[PDB]
UniProtKB/Swiss-Prot annotation:
Component of the 1.8 MDa SAGA complex, which consists of at least of TRA1, CHD1, SPT7, TAF5, ADA3, SGF73, SPT20/ADA5, SPT8, TAF12, TAF6, HFI1/ADA1, UBP8, GCN5, ADA2, SPT3, SGF29, TAF10, TAF9, SGF11 and SUS1. TAF5, TAF6, TAF9, TAF19, TAF12 and ADA1 seem to be present in 2 copies. SAGA is built of 5 distinct domains with specialized functions. Domain I (containing TRA1) probably represents the activator interaction surface. It comes from Saccharomyces cerevisiae (strain ATCC 204508 / S288c) (Baker's yeast). It is found in: Nucleus. Belongs to the SNF2/RAD54 helicase family. This is Chromo domain-containing protein 1. It comes from the Eukaryota. The 2 chromodomains are involved in the binding to the histone H3 methyllysine at position 4 (H3K4me3).
Amino acid sequence: DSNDFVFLLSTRAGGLGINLMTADTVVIFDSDWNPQADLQAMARAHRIG
DNA sequence: GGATGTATATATCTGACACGTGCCTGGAGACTAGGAAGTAATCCCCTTGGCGGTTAAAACGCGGGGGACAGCGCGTACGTGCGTTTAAGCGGTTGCTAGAGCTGTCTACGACCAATTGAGCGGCCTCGGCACCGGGATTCTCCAGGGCGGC
C-alpha cells in the first residue's frame, strides 16, 4: 500500500542487503569508476524472483 | 613754544647659492663560467567526495554554593608646601695615555686545486632475550568394600 514513487540512493551505501523488490526502473544518474558498484546498484532491484 | 609717536632710509648680520678642487667610487665596455631555467622519468603524498562502525567527547539541563562585586569604615601612608642644605652644572688646570687615522713592510695563514681514502648511510647475518611446545614431578577428587541397625 505504498504511495512512494521514487527512491533515491547514494550508490555505495547500504551494503548488499537492501531489498528493493517492488521497484522496476533504475536510473544511474552518476556513473561510478568501479562498474561493480553500478552492478550492485542494478542488482538492488534485479533480485531473484 | 618744547618734546613725543611714527614713517622712510642705511648699515650690518646671517642663511643660502654657486664656484672650485680632489678623489675615489660608481659606471661603461669586454669576457667568461656556472647558476638556474627547462625537460623527462619515477614515486609518494595530498585533494574531494563519499561509506561504515566505535566510542568517547561535546552538548544540554539543573541545582547550589562559592566567589565577584558593591558598600562602608578606618587609619595610615603618601601628597603638598615650605625652609634649608647640597651637590649638579659650568668653566678651568695639567700632564699623560688611549685611540682614530694614515702610511709602510712583511709574513704566516687561509683559499684553491688535484688525488686519495675512510667515515657515513643502507642492507644482511648473527646473538640476547622473550616466547611456544613437549615431558617429568606433585597434589586433589572420587568409587567401592566392610560393619552396624531395623522389620
